[PDB]
């Protein structure tokens, strides 16, 4: 519709501009913006990257070596007949493959907080930034990603990807989000076992960072020592209080305590006969 054609070349390539004319053309020239590059066989530009290829009375073509972002502009071919002037214009568009230049660091938040993740990429044409959740399929077309009231199931790796539609690869990058929540005791077991048989107590409280589980026998606490014949095994989500054989002093009330940086909890279980 408009005589402004788009001629996109990859950065660093060579751009050749061909101007096709009939026989009755008196003058002809290629112009960068409003500055002449070549007027027939006369070189006007001081840039050695511009070379003259064809000056046949049927076509006038020049070459640009090592095309750069600064070379982007409207290139016109003005030529003259005996009666009227002519211009055929071309718009040089430089393409740069997309690449992420800034992305958020691995963030930690407390459960229910608010998280904002940014993924900044540069590229020409303007690159499309996309956020993705690696554990559960989710996509948001935006440079920034905000998570409100983030929960346990939303923590994980958040991949960012950007592409400018070029043949080159999208150069995606990933960021890990780890939410923190205080321990909540989910499961508690008490044992009513006879003398001579083994028994065990346990508590189940999941927390991030993992809760330091504490055991209490009546007032005192257990140290997992061979004295009194007791041994506690602590895990990431549990802590089993193990009783090998029996003992008269072992019978009584017990309490476990699971605590991390965000809170603490305690539950009471007994050991009976």
């Amino acid at each position: 519709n408009s005589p402004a054609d788009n001629y996109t070349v990859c950065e660093g390539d060579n751009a050749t501009l061909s101007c096709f004319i009939d026989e009755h053309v008196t003058r002809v020239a290629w112009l960068n913006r409003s500055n002449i590059l070549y007027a027939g066989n006369d070189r006007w530009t001081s840039d050695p990257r511009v070379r003259l290829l064809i000056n046949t009375p049927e076509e006038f073509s020049i070459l640009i070596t090592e095309v750069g972002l600064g070379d982007e502009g409207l290139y016109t071919c003005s030529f003259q007949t005996r009666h009227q002037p002519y211009t055929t214009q071309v718009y040089l568009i430089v393409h740069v493959p997309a690449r992420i230049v800034n992305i958020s660091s691995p963030v930690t938040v407390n459960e229910g907080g608010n998280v904002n993740l940014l993924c900044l990429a540069v590229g020409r044409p303007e690159p499309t930034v996309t956020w993705r959740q690696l554990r559960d399929g989710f996509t948001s077309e935006g440079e920034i990603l905000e998570i409100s009231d983030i929960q346990r199931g939303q923590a994980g790796e958040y991949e960012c990807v950007t592409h400018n539609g070029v043949n080159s690869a999208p150069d995606s990058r990933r960021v890990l989000v780890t939410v923190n929540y205080p321990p909540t005791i989910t499961d508690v077991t008490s044992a009513r076992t006879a003398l001579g048989r083994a028994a065990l107590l346990r508590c189940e409280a999941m927390a991030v960072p993992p809760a330091d589980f504490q055991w209490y026998k009546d007032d005192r606490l257990l140290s997992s020592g061979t004295a009194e014949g007791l041994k506690v095994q602590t895990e990431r989500t549990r802590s089993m209080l193990l009783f090998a054989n029996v003992s008269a002093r072992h019978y009584g009330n017990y309490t476990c305590r699971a605590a991390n940086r965000l809170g603490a909890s305690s539950a009471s279980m007994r050991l009976l006969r």
Partner: protein
């Protein structure tokens, strides 16, 4: 230095200055995107376009008989080995206003409503305003059409249409109007009517044998037979009236 926007009149000669730098520098003039001059070569086929070279460093574009078609952006690309120089100039060509139509000199009778037209053109668009020759009047509102309802006797005369522009505005043409009114006698005889009436002096049964606006009777060596009541009959194509007076 020089100018970024240049305004000139239609038909004048415009000079777009573009002094270039010392050395072997070569200059080029550009109409829009096309080449007008490239150093010494004249790419243009127009006889009105030329280069005025006052000194070796001077490089100017001169357009004689500049027209509306010539308005637009002109670019002079001074080429220095270090960095090229560019001095674009937007040319605006002005057309003085021209009143191309106006109502003919008309003579319409009194009481009617008449509309006077005055159409003009130019670049930019002119504004048409009206006025009345008579001193006892107010300037009418800016409108190409002037409509008067029930025109009176005193509203006749010349109406001066004025088409104005911000620059080189003078464009004044007049149209005279004459309102015809049935004559009425104001004093006895003495009257006023248009077209000028032929006063008839009728004494009694018949008229027996004179300023344009007045009629003077002669009464010397008065006789007893002459005494009586006479009438002043003023008749025109529009109307006739009579007024008596004793003597």
């Amino acid at each position: 230095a020089a100018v970024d926007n240049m305004m000139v009149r239609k038909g004048d000669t415009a000079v777009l200055r573009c002094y270039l730098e010392d050395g072997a520098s070569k200059g080029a003039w550009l109409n829009r995107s096309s080449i007008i001059f490239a150093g010494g070569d004249k790419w243009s086929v127009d006889p009105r376009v030329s280069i005025s070279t006052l000194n070796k460093r001077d490089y100017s574009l001169q357009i004689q008989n500049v027209d509306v078609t010539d308005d637009g952006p002109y670019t002079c690309s001074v080429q220095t080995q270090h960095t090229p120089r560019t001095m674009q100039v937007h040319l605006t060509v002005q057309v003085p206003p021209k009143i191309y139509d106006i109502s003919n000199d008309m003579t319409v009778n009194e009481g009617t409503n008449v509309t006077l037209t005055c159409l003009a053109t130019g670049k930019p668009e002119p504004s048409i305003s009206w006025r009345h020759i008579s001193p006892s009047a107010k300037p009418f509102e800016n409108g190409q059409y002037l409509d008067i309802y029930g025109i009176t006797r005193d509203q006749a005369g010349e109406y001066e249409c004025s088409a104005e522009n911000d620059v080189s505005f003078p464009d004044v043409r007049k149209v005279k109007v004459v309102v015809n009114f049935a004559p009425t006698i104001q004093e006895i005889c003495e009257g006023a009517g248009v077209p000028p009436p032929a006063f008839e002096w009728y004494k009694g049964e018949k008229k027996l044998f004179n300023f344009s606006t007045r009629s003077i009777l002669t009464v010397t060596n008065v006789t007893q037979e002459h005494f009586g009541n006479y009438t002043c009959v003023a008749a025109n194509k529009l109307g006739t009236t009579n007024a008596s007076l004793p003597l």
